């Protein structure tokens, strides 16, 4: 499904991402734009045989099981297909796990390049949130 900007913002807000660990809603929305262009079915196959899934391009070697990745650890305890859903629930829960224990949002390199350090309230402007 290709989410609209405000559609995705409201869904993320419903799932507790707004200011989760101090990272405001506009940060999560900006990162999804530049990671997947808001496309839940975007997938990026990597040289090591893992693929990145969903609006935040989460990787199958560590975070989700796709049944096709040599040595998946599945830390979010989900099938990767759950990240392709129009239901954001599994994306929101797994993204919460990713941010709790590394470099925060620096985990998404497109976020560092396009979002970090700039006003991200503009990403939810006009959404009436």
Curated annotation (Swiss-Prot):
Question: GO cellular-component terms in the record?
Answer: extracellular region
Kindly state the subunit structure of this protein: Monomer.
Residues annotated as domain C-type lysozyme: 1-129
InterPro entries in alphabetical order: Glyco_hydro_22, Glyco_hydro_22_CS, Glyco_hydro_22_lys, Lysozyme-like_dom_sf
Tell me the PROSITE patterns matching this sequence: GLYCOSYL_HYDROL_F22_1, GLYCOSYL_HYDROL_F22_2
For this chain, the annotated S-S bridges are: 6-127, 30-115, 64-80, 76-94
Q: Which UniProt keywords apply?
A: Antimicrobial, Bacteriolytic enzyme, Disulfide bond, Glycosidase, Hydrolase, Secreted
Tell me which family the UniProt entry assigns to this protein.
Answer: Belongs to the glycosyl hydrolase 22 family.
Name the source organism.
Numida meleagris (Helmeted guineafowl)
Q: Which GO terms describe its biological process?
A: defense response to Gram-negative bacterium; defense response to Gram-positive bacterium; killing of cells of another organism
Its predominant location is secreted
Enzyme class, one word? hydrolase
Q: What is this protein called?
A: Lysozyme C
Q: What else is known?
A: Lysozyme C is capable of both hydrolysis and transglycosylation; it also shows a slight esterase activity. It acts rapidly on both peptide-substituted and unsubstituted peptidoglycan, and slowly on chitin oligosaccharides.
Q: Which purpose does this protein serve, as stated in its record? A: Lysozymes have primarily a bacteriolytic function; those in tissues and body fluids are associated with the monocyte-macrophage system and enhance the activity of immunoagents.
The EC number(s) this enzyme carries: 3.2.1.17
- Molecular function GO labels: lysozyme activity
């Amino acid at each position: 499904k290709v989410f609209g900007r405000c559609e995705l913002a409201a869904a993320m807000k419903r799932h507790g991402l707004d200011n989760y660990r101090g990272y405001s809603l506009g940060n999560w929305v900006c990162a999804a734009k530049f990671e997947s262009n808001f496309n839940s079915q975007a997938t990026n196959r990597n040289t090591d045989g893992s693929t990145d899934y969903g609006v935040l391009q989460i990787n199958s070697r560590w975070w989700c099981n796709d049944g096709r990745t040599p040595g998946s650890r599945n830390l979010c305890n989900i099938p990767c297909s759950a990240l392709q859903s129009s239901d954001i629930t599994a994306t929101a829960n797994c993204a919460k796990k990713i941010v709790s224990d590394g470099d925060g949002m620096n985990a998404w390199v497109a976020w560092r390049k396009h979002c970090k350090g700039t006003d991200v309230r503009v990403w939810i402007k006009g959404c009436r949130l």
